[PDB]
Amino acid sequence: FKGLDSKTFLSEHSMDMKFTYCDDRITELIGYHPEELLGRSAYEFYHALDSENMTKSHQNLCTKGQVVSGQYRMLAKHGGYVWLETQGTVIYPQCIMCVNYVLSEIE
Amino acid sequence: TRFISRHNIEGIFTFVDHRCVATVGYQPQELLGKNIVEFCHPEDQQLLRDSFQQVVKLKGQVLSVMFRFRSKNQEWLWMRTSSFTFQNPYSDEIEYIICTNTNVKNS
Numbered sequence: 001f002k003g004l005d006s007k008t009f010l011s012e013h014s015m016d017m018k019f020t021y022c023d024d025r026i027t028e029l030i031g032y033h034p035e036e037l038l039g040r041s042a043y044e045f046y047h048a049l050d051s052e053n054m055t056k057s058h059q060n061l062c063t064k065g066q067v068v069s070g071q072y073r074m075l076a077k078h079g080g081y082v083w084l085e086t087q088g089t090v091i092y093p094q095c096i097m098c099v100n101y102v103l104s105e106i107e
Numbered sequence: 108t109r110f111i112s113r114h115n116i117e118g119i120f121t122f123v124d125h126r127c128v129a130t131v132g133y134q135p136q137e138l139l140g141k142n143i144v145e146f147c148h149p150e151d152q153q154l155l156r157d158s159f160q161q162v163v164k165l166k167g168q169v170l171s172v173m174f175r176f177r178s179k180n181q182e183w184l185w186m187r188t189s190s191f192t193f194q195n196p197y198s199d200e201i202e203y204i205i206c207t208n209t210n211v212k213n214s
């Protein structure tokens with residue numbers, strides 16, 4: 001069992017959705033080292049079955065400024081997926097700041 | 108040039124992204140545990156206290172502030188700090204404040 005801080009990590013993205021910063025907490029939770037995420041779009045990582053819903057959620061972020069994703073899957077570093085939920089906030093556009101909460105182990 | 112920080116609702120740095128070294132010159136451990144107000148020009152200090160006080164009332168939306176931050180070279184750098192609260196809805200733990208801090212022109 002993990003406490004809340006240990007299941008939450010921050011990330012920052014450019015407006016093209018590429019990672020520009022990620023907290024090292026992601027490594028224990030999903031396997032990635034932050035430096036290997038940089039420059040890669042979030043879209044590389046969404047499960048196929050979430051991709052259309054995430055594209056809609058990105059539209060919503062760009063029109064409203066702030067959105068909660070609802071539950072979706074991230075491809076983990078050695079394969080399989082983790083469920084996450086994210087609050088995304090645009091910083092004005094300059095970058096998007098995400099607070100990410102893990103809902104599951106690697107499945 | 109920007110870096111992320113997390114603060115308690117009082118203003119104390121509780122997490123500092125290492126991009127702070129290139130932004131303002133300090134190692135993260137020189138900022139951690141101190142109040143952001145300790146690095147703020149005396150004319151701007153009250154504005155920054157009142158910004159941290161208000162950001163918790165804004166229902167999680169972004170508050171921006173510009174203020175003069177003391178670099179590791181004891182020079183005043185204009186910063187634009189965009190801040191918002193985060194509280195994990197599965198819990199009733201005290202919210203904390205997430206900031207993005209950019210060196211900006213005052214022109």
Ligand SMILES: O=[N+]([O-])c1cc(S(=O)(=O)C(F)F)ccc1Oc1cc(F)cc(Br)c1
Nearest residue numbers: 013017042045057058061069074086088096
């Ligand atoms: O790219 N984002 O700005 C972003 C927005 C959102 S959002 O909810 O604001 C919406 F645009 F989809 C959600 C995820 C987002 O990125 C990720 C962050 C992660 F740690 C992992 C994964 Br996979 C994606």
